[PDB]
């Protein structure tokens, strides 16, 4: 569940006897995501890995450069 502040409110304090559109509409065990939501979800998932703490571009040198230097040592 993507618990949020709007999911917190239990609306059943209102009577709300009726249900819509119909019982024929399934409940699907997965969060209903918009198209833009799916694009953003996969983009954030990839970005987190590629821009991790070790893999970021931030001795004024990045961790990736040091790792690659060690790899060149092993190649030699």
Pairwise CA distance, residues 72 & 76, whole Å: 6
The site that binds other proteins (CB under 8 A) totals a number of residues, namely 20
Q: Is 58 in the site for other proteins (CB under 8 A)?
A: no
CB 23 to other proteins: min, Å = 13
Q: Is 11 in the site for other proteins (CB under 8 A)?
A: yes
For residue 53, the 8-state DSSP code is: T
For the chain, what is the radius of gyration of the CA atoms? 24
Q: Tell me which stretch binds other proteins (CB under 8 A): 2-10, 53-61, 64-72.
A: 2-10
CB-CB neighbours of 64 under 10 Å: 13
52: nearest Cα among 42, 67, 64: 64
Q: Is 26 in the site for other proteins (CB under 8 A)?
A: yes
- Rule CB under 8 A: which residues touch other proteins? 8-11, 13-14, 16, 20-21, 25-26, 28, 30, 32-35, 38, 42, 49
């Amino acid at each position: 569940n993507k618990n949020d502040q709007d999911l917190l409110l239990n609306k059943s304090f209102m009577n709300l006897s009726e249900i819509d559109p119909n019982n024929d509409l399934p409940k699907f065990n997965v969060n209903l995501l918009t198209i833009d939501e799916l694009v953003e979800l996969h983009g954030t998932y990839i970005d987190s890995i590629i821009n991790s703490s070790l893999l970021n571009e931030k001795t004024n040198i990045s961790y990736i450069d040091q790792i690659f230097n060690i790899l060149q040592t092993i190649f030699n």
